[PDB]
Design a protein around this motif. Structure first.
Motif, PDB file in Angstrom:
ATOM      1  N   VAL A  16      -4.065   5.630   2.047  1.00  0.00           N
ATOM      2  CA  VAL A  16      -5.260   5.060   1.416  1.00  0.00           C
ATOM      3  C   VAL A  16      -5.651   5.874   0.185  1.00  0.00           C
ATOM      4  CG1 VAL A  16      -7.656   4.239   1.817  1.00  0.00           C
ATOM      5  CG2 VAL A  16      -5.981   4.245   3.643  1.00  0.00           C
ATOM      6  N   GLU A  17      -5.539   7.197   0.282  1.00  0.00           N
ATOM      7  CA  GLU A  17      -5.799   8.080  -0.849  1.00  0.00           C
ATOM      8  C   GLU A  17      -4.939   7.716  -2.044  1.00  0.00           C
ATOM      9  OE1 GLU A  17      -4.506  10.828  -2.506  1.00  0.00           O
ATOM     10  OE2 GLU A  17      -6.305  12.027  -2.938  1.00  0.00           O
ATOM     11  N   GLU A  18      -3.643   7.511  -1.811  1.00  0.00           N
ATOM     12  CA  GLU A  18      -2.753   7.240  -2.933  1.00  0.00           C
ATOM     13  C   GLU A  18      -3.045   5.879  -3.532  1.00  0.00           C
ATOM     14  OE1 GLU A  18       0.953   7.916  -0.733  1.00  0.00           O
ATOM     15  OE2 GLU A  18       0.886  10.001  -1.478  1.00  0.00           O
ATOM     16  N   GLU A  19      -3.537   4.946  -2.712  1.00  0.00           N
ATOM     17  CA  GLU A  19      -4.003   3.661  -3.222  1.00  0.00           C
ATOM     18  C   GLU A  19      -5.249   3.808  -4.083  1.00  0.00           C
ATOM     19  OE1 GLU A  19      -1.789   0.863  -0.228  1.00  0.00           O
ATOM     20  OE2 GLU A  19      -2.843   0.425  -2.130  1.00  0.00           O
ATOM     21  N   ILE A  20      -6.184   4.680  -3.686  1.00  0.00           N
ATOM     22  CA  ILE A  20      -7.390   4.833  -4.483  1.00  0.00           C
ATOM     23  C   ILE A  20      -7.051   5.470  -5.822  1.00  0.00           C
ATOM     24  CG2 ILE A  20      -9.695   5.946  -4.612  1.00  0.00           C
ATOM     25  CD1 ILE A  20      -9.407   3.419  -2.685  1.00  0.00           C
ATOM     26  N   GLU A  21      -6.145   6.445  -5.834  1.00  0.00           N
ATOM     27  CA  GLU A  21      -5.747   7.010  -7.120  1.00  0.00           C
ATOM     28  C   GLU A  21      -5.047   5.966  -7.984  1.00  0.00           C
ATOM     29  OE1 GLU A  21      -3.578  10.657  -6.669  1.00  0.00           O
ATOM     30  OE2 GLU A  21      -5.108  11.369  -5.249  1.00  0.00           O
ATOM     31  N   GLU A  22      -4.213   5.123  -7.372  1.00  0.00           N
ATOM     32  CA  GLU A  22      -3.542   4.083  -8.140  1.00  0.00           C
ATOM     33  C   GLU A  22      -4.548   3.092  -8.695  1.00  0.00           C
ATOM     34  OE1 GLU A  22      -0.928   3.597  -9.614  1.00  0.00           O
ATOM     35  OE2 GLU A  22      -1.272   1.495 -10.136  1.00  0.00           O
ATOM     36  N   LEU A  23      -5.481   2.659  -7.844  1.00  0.00           N
ATOM     37  CA  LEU A  23      -6.562   1.785  -8.278  1.00  0.00           C
ATOM     38  C   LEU A  23      -7.360   2.409  -9.411  1.00  0.00           C
ATOM     39  CD1 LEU A  23      -8.267  -0.690  -8.080  1.00  0.00           C
ATOM     40  CD2 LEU A  23      -9.379   0.259  -6.047  1.00  0.00           C
ATOM     41  N   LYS A  24      -7.659   3.705  -9.318  1.00  0.00           N
ATOM     42  CA  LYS A  24      -8.442   4.326 -10.383  1.00  0.00           C
ATOM     43  C   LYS A  24      -7.656   4.338 -11.685  1.00  0.00           C
ATOM     44  CE  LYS A  24     -10.289   8.110  -8.164  1.00  0.00           C
ATOM     45  NZ  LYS A  24      -9.803   9.127  -9.141  1.00  0.00           N
ATOM     46  N   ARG A  25      -6.338   4.492 -11.588  1.00  0.00           N
ATOM     47  CA  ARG A  25      -5.480   4.436 -12.762  1.00  0.00           C
ATOM     48  C   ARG A  25      -5.523   3.049 -13.392  1.00  0.00           C
ATOM     49  NH1 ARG A  25      -0.964   3.227 -15.283  1.00  0.00           N
ATOM     50  NH2 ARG A  25      -0.812   1.930 -13.378  1.00  0.00           N
ATOM     51  N   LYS A  26      -5.474   1.998 -12.563  1.00  0.00           N
ATOM     52  CA  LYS A  26      -5.571   0.640 -13.084  1.00  0.00           C
ATOM     53  C   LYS A  26      -6.882   0.441 -13.835  1.00  0.00           C
ATOM     54  CE  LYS A  26      -2.781  -2.374 -10.067  1.00  0.00           C
ATOM     55  NZ  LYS A  26      -2.061  -1.266  -9.366  1.00  0.00           N
ATOM     56  N   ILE A  27      -8.005   0.772 -13.187  1.00  0.00           N
ATOM     57  CA  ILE A  27      -9.314   0.512 -13.773  1.00  0.00           C
ATOM     58  C   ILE A  27      -9.390   1.104 -15.171  1.00  0.00           C
ATOM     59  CG2 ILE A  27     -11.789   0.967 -13.561  1.00  0.00           C
ATOM     60  CD1 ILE A  27     -11.211   1.140 -10.421  1.00  0.00           C
ATOM     61  N   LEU A  28      -8.883   2.325 -15.334  1.00  0.00           N
ATOM     62  CA  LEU A  28      -8.897   2.972 -16.640  1.00  0.00           C
ATOM     63  C   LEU A  28      -8.010   2.245 -17.642  1.00  0.00           C
ATOM     64  CD1 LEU A  28      -9.078   6.710 -15.766  1.00  0.00           C
ATOM     65  CD2 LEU A  28     -10.841   5.141 -16.543  1.00  0.00           C
ATOM     66  N   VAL A  29      -6.795   1.846 -17.244  1.00  0.00           N
ATOM     67  CA  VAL A  29      -5.997   1.004 -18.132  1.00  0.00           C
ATOM     68  C   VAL A  29      -6.806  -0.217 -18.541  1.00  0.00           C
ATOM     69  CG1 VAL A  29      -3.940  -0.470 -18.309  1.00  0.00           C
ATOM     70  CG2 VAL A  29      -3.793   1.792 -17.305  1.00  0.00           C
ATOM     71  N   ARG A  30      -7.468  -0.852 -17.570  1.00  0.00           N
ATOM     72  CA  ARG A  30      -8.213  -2.067 -17.878  1.00  0.00           C
ATOM     73  C   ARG A  30      -9.419  -1.817 -18.788  1.00  0.00           C
ATOM     74  NH1 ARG A  30      -8.417  -7.760 -17.892  1.00  0.00           N
ATOM     75  NH2 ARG A  30      -7.289  -7.903 -15.874  1.00  0.00           N
ATOM     76  N   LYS A  31     -10.107  -0.679 -18.666  1.00  0.00           N
ATOM     77  CA  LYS A  31     -11.225  -0.441 -19.578  1.00  0.00           C
ATOM     78  C   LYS A  31     -10.724  -0.345 -21.013  1.00  0.00           C
ATOM     79  CE  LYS A  31     -14.515   1.771 -16.286  1.00  0.00           C
ATOM     80  NZ  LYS A  31     -15.564   0.740 -16.008  1.00  0.00           N
ATOM     81  N   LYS A  32      -9.647   0.433 -21.241  1.00  0.00           N
ATOM     82  CA  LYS A  32      -9.098   0.561 -22.593  1.00  0.00           C
ATOM     83  C   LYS A  32      -8.587  -0.782 -23.109  1.00  0.00           C
ATOM     84  CE  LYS A  32      -5.392   3.059 -23.522  1.00  0.00           C
ATOM     85  NZ  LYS A  32      -4.379   4.055 -24.002  1.00  0.00           N
ATOM     86  N   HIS A  33      -7.877  -1.535 -22.271  1.00  0.00           N
ATOM     87  CA  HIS A  33      -7.532  -2.908 -22.630  1.00  0.00           C
ATOM     88  C   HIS A  33      -8.745  -3.687 -23.124  1.00  0.00           C
ATOM     89  CE1 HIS A  33      -6.967  -7.234 -21.809  1.00  0.00           C
ATOM     90  NE2 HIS A  33      -5.694  -7.033 -22.107  1.00  0.00           N
ATOM     91  N   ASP A  34      -9.846  -3.687 -22.351  1.00  0.00           N
ATOM     92  CA  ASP A  34     -10.963  -4.569 -22.699  1.00  0.00           C
ATOM     93  C   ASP A  34     -11.739  -4.060 -23.919  1.00  0.00           C
ATOM     94  OD1 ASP A  34     -10.299  -6.273 -20.589  1.00  0.00           O
ATOM     95  OD2 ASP A  34     -11.828  -5.427 -19.235  1.00  0.00           O
ATOM     96  N   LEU A  35     -11.791  -2.754 -24.143  1.00  0.00           N
ATOM     97  CA  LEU A  35     -12.405  -2.297 -25.382  1.00  0.00           C
ATOM     98  C   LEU A  35     -11.587  -2.784 -26.572  1.00  0.00           C
ATOM     99  CD1 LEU A  35     -13.567   1.148 -24.134  1.00  0.00           C
ATOM    100  CD2 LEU A  35     -14.975  -0.905 -24.695  1.00  0.00           C
ATOM    101  N   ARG A  36     -10.263  -2.621 -26.497  1.00  0.00           N
ATOM    102  CA  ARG A  36      -9.394  -3.063 -27.572  1.00  0.00           C
ATOM    103  C   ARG A  36      -9.503  -4.564 -27.790  1.00  0.00           C
ATOM    104  NH1 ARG A  36      -4.170   0.725 -26.031  1.00  0.00           N
ATOM    105  NH2 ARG A  36      -4.719   2.437 -27.460  1.00  0.00           N
TER     106      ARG A  36
END
Length: 53
Positions: A16-36
């Protein structure tokens, strides 16, 4: 075997920990995507209005 079960829960907690880190990585990719995407949308609007007047 109550320390077999404990070893199972310990392994599930690690997963579950490794999933939360992966999810947190996605969210950050998505924030930069949406700002751009927002930034580009503004540039196109300025461009449209420039051809308007």
């Amino acid at each position: 075997s109550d320390d077999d079960i404990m070893m199972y829960e310990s392994a599930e907690l690690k997963r579950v920990e490794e999933e939360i880190e992966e999810l947190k990585r996605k969210i950050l990719v998505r924030k930069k995507h949406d700002l751009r995407k927002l930034s580009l949308n503004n540039q196109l609007q300025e461009l449209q209005s420039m051809m308007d007047g």
